[PDB]
Design a protein around this ligand. Structure first.
Ligand SMILES: [Ca+2]
Ligand SMILES: [Ca+2]
Length: 109
């Protein structure tokens, strides 16, 4: 559950900001949810909840469901929003987000 790391109200604030399709911005999202300023081990705890099938990577299918990892009231990301997350975070160009790529995205937000 994300409340092991993040405040319940910050999660709801961030879900509200992105309730409508096409609005996602990863930098604003990590600022609103309070993931900035957390330790490397807390960020990797969040990474592990988002990696639903426990493959060690957030594949595109799971990137689409990133907001639902924080709240069941969230919506799915559309394909333009999912591609923008790979454009910004997929450093080694293998088409998915690894743990240190995810930690980097949080660091640069
Ligand atoms: Ca996975
Ligand atoms: Ca990658």
């Amino acid at each position: 559950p994300m409340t092991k790391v993040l405040k319940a109200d910050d999660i709801n604030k961030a879900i509200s900001a992105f309730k409508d399709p096409g609005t996602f911005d990863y930098k604003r999202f990590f600022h609103l949810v309070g993931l900035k300023g957390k330790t490397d081990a807390q960020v990797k705890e969040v990474f592990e909840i988002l990696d639903k099938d426990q493959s060690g990577f957030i594949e595109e299918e799971e990137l689409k469901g990133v907001l639902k990892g924080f709240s069941a009231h969230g919506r799915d990301l559309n394909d333009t929003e999912t591609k923008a997350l790979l454009a910004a975070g997929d450093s080694d160009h293998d088409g998915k987000i690894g743990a240190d790529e995810f930690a980097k995205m949080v660091a640069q937000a």
